[PDB]
Structure to design on (280 residues):
């Protein structure tokens, strides 16, 4: 499992979410933040190893505008993930 | 240390916070977020730094308190932390 | 690469941003959160999220520690998280070392 944290332009959020959905990426969490200050959207997406590239690519393509300020995408290691509904791991 | 990131239902937050307090967990950060399991749902994200010996007990407290058994309960991520510092003292841990 | 997560007092934000820019740090993300320390109900804090290369880890941490300190309970904490890789959306450039 990996945890993807992406910072994108609010104006590109809808396009980004559509792209993720298209790529079969459904689980995600997002919040509004400020960055350098300008408003931005932060997405945190927990994915299995096979979905790292597809997720990263969906965002790269949908979030780019070509102008400085487009954002970044971090891929973080995750040691364990638990599903609250079942109380079981993964 | 590890960093616990839990996404829970808003209606379960008080129960979660009570469970953490009872499990001796005092240090934590939280905020409101939106999530999908276009339909976004309000959720609450908790970020808790906890040392290895106590990761399991802390995760368990959240699991029990946040559960409803219905789809949408959320997930808990446990991330590795290379280093942690206390600002009040600068202490490397 | 590393991802620095710092929780600081709102009152210390401007001083922290100042020290960071001075340390040649510029790109970063921040948000308002509610928190509580290890003592004994929640208080507002500012959460900084800073992606940096290995050479900038020590300098970034040093800047926050020096500027965000009041010496009183509630000062916050700094987490240095491992990053597998980072992509710049505009250029598609990837960093890993
Ligand atoms: N190093 C970083 N750490 C954390 N967040 C960052 C970092 N760099 C950029 N960001 C986030 O992404 C936003 C835009 O980044 P920016 O570097 O301007 O993109 P671009 O590569 O197009 O110039 C920043 O305002 C912030 O929200
Ligand atoms: N893989 C994930 N990555 C990031 N956040 C997630 C992920 N899965 C779920 N979430 C967060 O947990 C909330 C509830 O998700 P979940 O319990 O899986 O409901 P569902 O069963 O419909 O997927 C989501 O709204 C989101 O905030
Ligand atoms: N273990 C933790 N996990 C996540 N956030 C924490 C943790 N401990 C403290 N915080 C954040 O820092 C704030 C408390 O500051 P802290 O440094 O613990 O006080 P003190 O300077 O007395 O050590 C909390 O309100 C929260 O925002």
């Amino acid at each position: 499992m990996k945890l993807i944290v992406a910072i994108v332009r609010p104006e590109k959020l809808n396009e980004v979410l559509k792209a993720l959905f298209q790529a079969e990426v459904r689980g995600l969490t997002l919040s509004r933040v400020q960055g350098h200050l300008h408003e931005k959207v932060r997405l945190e997406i927990g994915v299995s190893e096979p979905f790292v590239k597809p997720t990263v690519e969906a965002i790269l393509k949908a979030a780019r505008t070509g102008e400085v300020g487009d954002g970044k995408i971090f891929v973080l290691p995750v040691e364990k993930v638990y599903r609250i509904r079942t109380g079981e791991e993964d």
In short: The longest strand of chain B covers residues 41-50.
